[PDB]
A paper describes a structure:
Lytic polysaccharide monooxygenases (LPMOs) are auxiliary activity enzymes that also attack cellulose, as well as other polysaccharides, using an oxidative mechanism. LPMOs are compact globular enzymes that lack a substrate binding cleft or tunnel, and instead have a copper atom containing active site located near a planar binding surface. [name], a model cellulolytic bacterium, secretes two LPMOs, the type I (TfAA10B) and type III (TfAA10A). The first LPMO structure to be solved was the chitinolytic LPMO SmCBP21 and more recently several bacterial LPMOs acting on cellulose have been investigated. These structures share a common immunoglobulin-like β-sandwich core fold, a flat binding surface, and a conserved N-terminal histidine.
The structure of TfAA10A was refined to a resolution of 2.0 Å with R and Rfree of 0.167 and 0.233, respectively. There are two molecules in the asymmetric unit with two copper atoms and multiple iodides. It has an Ig-like β-sandwich fold with a copper ion bound on the active site. A histidine brace, a conserved feature of LPMOs coordination with copper, facilitated by the N-terminal histidine 37 can be clearly observed in TfAA10A. An interesting feature of TfAA10A is the axial position of the copper coordination sphere, which is tyrosine. In most AA10 LPMOs and in TfAA10B, a phenylalanine occupies this position. The copper atom at the active site of chain A is 50% occupied and the one with chain B has occupancy of 31%. The active site of chain A has type I copper coordination in agreement with previous studies while the more distorted active site of chain B includes some features similar to type 2 with an equatorial water (wat550) in contact with the copper. Clearly, both active sites have been photo-reduced by X-ray radiation during data collection supporting the assumption that copper(II) is the catalytically competent state. Closer comparison between the Streptomyces coelicolor lytic polysaccharide monooxygenase and TfAA10A reveals almost identical backbone and His144, Tyr213, Trp82 and Asn83 at the same locations and conformations.
Residue numbers in the entry: 37 to 222
The structure:
Amino acid sequence: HGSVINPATRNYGCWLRWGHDHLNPNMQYEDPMCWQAWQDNPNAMWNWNGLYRDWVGGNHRAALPDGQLCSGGLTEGGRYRSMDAVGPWKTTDVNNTFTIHLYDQASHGADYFLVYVTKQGFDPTTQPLTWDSLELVHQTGSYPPAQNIQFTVHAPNRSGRHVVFTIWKASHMDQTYYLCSDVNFV
Ligand SMILES: [Cu+2]
């Protein structure tokens, strides 16, 4: 159980920024995407480390229909479905070369990570996330059990607002985490 801490995923960030003030009506105006998320299902944030599927068998495309990538294909009864929403999600500023930092409290290890980034021209404020919209920019091999895992990726030919989609395949069983992070390539 865990998530990408940097660049923070959607639900981790929503928890981090608003967990201490989750019913604040001004969230609507300060962080509208976090607002809609908290409105829909507070557990998307309280259980921020739980965005996984079991028994995907490597078939990520089958498990995650277009427009449901960020929710893990509506995993856990749609718990994270608000992650699929379209709009001005808060971004982390990154360079074209950036570090992914995963935290996993259970130290499951990883068989691999896949890192996809949206193509130039994609607009996350108006368009749902699709497999077409993403290109694979990084692939790792396995990592031993550890609470913190990090590695550097390069996402070429990108500028401004994008989505980084990280697939983390745990080593303890066929459990796969699906981690969307909003970024701004500066
Ligand atoms: Cu776990």
